[PDB]
């Protein structure tokens, strides 16, 4: 029983799937859902924005990582661990990693329209929740994300 992991995977999977398919999921989010929905709304707003201005860089990275299929996620996990290896953790880095995950997911859908986004979403969620567990907990998890990116 791991609610933070469950919640994180739901948020990230939903974002990746929407981005990949172009369609929103009309199914009530699990327990919580209030924070999750606001997190997903935040992720749409800021994640789309990251993808903007950085299309060239993202394409560059996709190409260099040569991600061949829905299951080829080991290299991305390594890259994410490497990003955090200077010892710095913040929501800008996290949203950028998730946004890049959505970028990859979109591209995998073009090559194969039957591609599952779950391996990618699981790989990203694993890095975030497992390696930043206490950092997330201290901050009431996704509330930290919501408030950091909150605009009036």
């Amino acid at each position: 029983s791991d609610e933070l992991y469950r919640q994180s995977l739901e948020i990230i999977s939903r974002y990746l799937r929407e981005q990949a398919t172009g369609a929103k999921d009309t199914k009530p989010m699990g327990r919580s859902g209030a924070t999750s929905r606001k997190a997903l709304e935040t992720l749409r707003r800021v994640g789309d924005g990251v993808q903007r201005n950085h299309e060239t860089a993202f394409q560059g990275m996709l190409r260099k990582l040569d991600i061949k299929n829905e299951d080829d996620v080991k290299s991305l996990s390594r890259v994410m661990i490497h990003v955090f290896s200077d010892g710095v953790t913040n929501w800008g880095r996290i949203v950028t990693l998730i946004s890049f995950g959505a970028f990859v997911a979109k591209h995998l859908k073009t090559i194969n329209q039957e591609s599952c986004i779950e391996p990618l979403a699981e790989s990203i969620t694993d890095v975030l929740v497992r390696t930043k567990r206490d950092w997330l907990v201290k901050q009431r998890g996704w509330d930290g994300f919501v408030e950091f990116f909150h605009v009036e």
């Binding site: 860089a57 890259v79 994410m80 990003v83 290896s85 800008g92 950028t96």
Partner: peptide
């Protein structure tokens, strides 16, 4: 290595976005 370069790139963008929202 492509993996080191990708990490450098994602970190640059990540910190930029962090600094943006403060």
């Amino acid at each position: 290595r492509p993996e080191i370069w990708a990490a450098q790139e994602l970190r640059r963008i990540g910190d930029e976005f962090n600094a943006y929202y403060r």
